[PDB]
Amino acid sequence: RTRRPGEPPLDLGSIPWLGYALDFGKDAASFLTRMKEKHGDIFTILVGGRYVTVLLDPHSYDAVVWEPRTRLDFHAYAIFLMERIFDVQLPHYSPSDEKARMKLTLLHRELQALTEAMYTNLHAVLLGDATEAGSGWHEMGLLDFSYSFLLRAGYLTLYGIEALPRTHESQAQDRVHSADVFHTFRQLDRLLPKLARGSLSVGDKDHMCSVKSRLWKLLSPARLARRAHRSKWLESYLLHLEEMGVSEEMQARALVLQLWATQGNMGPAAFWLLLFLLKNPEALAAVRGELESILWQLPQKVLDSTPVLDSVLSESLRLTAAPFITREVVVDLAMPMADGREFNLRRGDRLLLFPFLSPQRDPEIYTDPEVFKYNRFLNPDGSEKKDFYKDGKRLKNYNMPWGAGHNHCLGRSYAVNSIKQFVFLVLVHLDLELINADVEIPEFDLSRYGFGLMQPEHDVPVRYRIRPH
Numbered sequence: 001r002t003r004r005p006g007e008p009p010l011d012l013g014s015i016p017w018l019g020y021a022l023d024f025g026k027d028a029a030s031f032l033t034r035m036k037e038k039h040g041d042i043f044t045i046l047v048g049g050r051y052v053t054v055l056l057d058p059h060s061y062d063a064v065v066w067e068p069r070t071r072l073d074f075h076a077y078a079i080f081l082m083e084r085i086f087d088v089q090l091p092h093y094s095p096s097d098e099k100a101r102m103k104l105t106l107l108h109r110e111l112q113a114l115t116e117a118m119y120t121n122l123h124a125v126l127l128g129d130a131t132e133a134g135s136g137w138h139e140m141g142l143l144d145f146s147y148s149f150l151l152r153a154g155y156l157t158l159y160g161i162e163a164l165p166r167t168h169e170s171q172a173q174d175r176v177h178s179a180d181v182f183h184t185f186r187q188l189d190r191l192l193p194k195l196a197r198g199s200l201s202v203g204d205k206d207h208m209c210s211v212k213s214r215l216w217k218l219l220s221p222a223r224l225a226r227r228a229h230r231s232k233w234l235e236s237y238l239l240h241l242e243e244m245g246v247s248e249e250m251q252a253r254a255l256v257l258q259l260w261a262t263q264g265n266m267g268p269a270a271f272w273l274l275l276f277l278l279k280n281p282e283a284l285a286a287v288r289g290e291l292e293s294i295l296w297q298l299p300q301k302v303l304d305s306t307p308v309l310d311s312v313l314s315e316s317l318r319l320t321a322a323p324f325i326t327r328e329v330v331v332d333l334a335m336p337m338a339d340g341r342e343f344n345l346r347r348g349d350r351l352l353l354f355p356f357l358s359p360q361r362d363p364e365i366y367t368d369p370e371v372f373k374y375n376r377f378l379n380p381d382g383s384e385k386k387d388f389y390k391d392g393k394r395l396k397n398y399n400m401p402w403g404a405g406h407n408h409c410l411g412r413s414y415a416v417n418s419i420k421q422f423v424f425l426v427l428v429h430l431d432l433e434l435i436n437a438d439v440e441i442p443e444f445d446l447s448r449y450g451f452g453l454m455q456p457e458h459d460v461p462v463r464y465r466i467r468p469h
């Protein structure tokens, strides 16, 4: 490939066809940071036979993310995930249509219904497990801890419970069942990045197929039909699939895709948040102080009146949420930059924006971006800090864990509420400690850049107990 007039800087690397496939795959953030240093805020790279133009000027993001599908296609990842990763085939499939239908089931009123059920399920699973284990300290990995309880509760909230009214045995059954779902799901979640790259070994392939087969059985419509207090989201989705004449077996596959889609981020998000608090005594004291003040007067103020916790969650996501925002270039076109520049992109190129690098870890926007500063999103007077700058201009987009434009989180309020509820339960109802107070924060699994929340390369040992009194 030879650069044409008005195109971004072009960097093909050394290896024919593959280009920077290895570098990008191994550690996308480090690789792209170097490319930014070399080329500036926009550049084109060869990666695995594809030409990818990377845009890293956060002021220029807004234009891109709202472009019509006639210019920049925002359906490609959804199709790839549905058909190529989760093995789902739907008739007349349109990601926009599916998204619009889901929105209608996730309006403010319904998200508030989910929030109420979520607290009940978080409480039931957390205190249920803790009660079964008994009053002592119990040792666990913090990710296993956070991901298990959030996913199990999220599953019970969206997909329903064993019985209503709730009984001792039905709740116990949901603890065992949800644990099975989680343990099976985690095997898929660990293998997903390798599946996406097509790098599974013969043995890995058999493992993934076995896990998929089990999950498809567990979340079959026949199994789900008997469950109580199913979410409107689920009921509507099932009705939609039925109306399209989708088989119950294919519905199962679609439902497993949704399990990963909706539950693959909250647990990891909470893991990092709790870890940051445990490693930063002042931050932890501020959060506990805020929550205890509310307790002394789920108390509704925990959701609507936790300014310190809001900053903490924003700060944790700033450091750890790393989704790619991608588009396929549909036609040869000119893309405007915020500074007045214009760059030509070619039909068939991929466009990649990476908020993790900028704005989120941009040292011109945030002072010491690598550091967890619990009050980064607080003004001195305690009000929310919303004013961040780059290149002499106020940023519209400064922290983007929920996406932007056409592809943004439809469950944000519920996701935020769920994480807050979990943190409240853990910090107020439990004692929670690092085994080693001096343990260093683990590196990311660097191969997972682009999906959403990062996961740690290894877990962090903690211990918890029910608060003695």
Ligand code: HEM
Binding pocket: 077, 078, 095, 098, 099, 102, 261, 262, 263, 265, 266, 269, 321, 323, 401, 402, 403, 407, 408, 409, 410, 411, 412, 414, 415, 452, 453
């Ligand atoms: C911390 C947790 C979460 C984060 C950071 C997050 C972030 C995101 C992002 C970045 C997208 C855009 C995806 C893309 O098109 O590339 C998205 C989409 C979406 N999210 Fe979330 N999300 C979270 C949790 C949830 C939860 C708990 C729900 C509901 C239970 C939810 C519902 C949705 C829906 C329905 C979409 C649109 C899917 C589609 O395009 O068909 N999210 N989210």
Ligand SMILES: CCCCCCCCO[C@@H]1O[C@H](CO)[C@@H](O)[C@H](O)[C@H]1O
Binding pocket: 076, 077, 080, 196, 324, 326, 449, 450, 451
């Ligand atoms: C790299 C995995 C993180 C998710 C990125 C979502 C946007 C593109 O998703 C996929 O990425 C693959 C590898 O780059 C490409 O080969 C596929 O064509 C593309 O659909």
Ligand SMILES: Nc1cc(N2CCCCC2)nc(N)[n+]1[O-]
Binding pocket: 077, 078, 081, 261, 262, 265, 409, 452
């Ligand atoms: N982060 C994501 C991603 C996601 N996807 C659905 C399929 C298309 C892009 C990824 N769905 C949901 N619910 N969340 O929360």
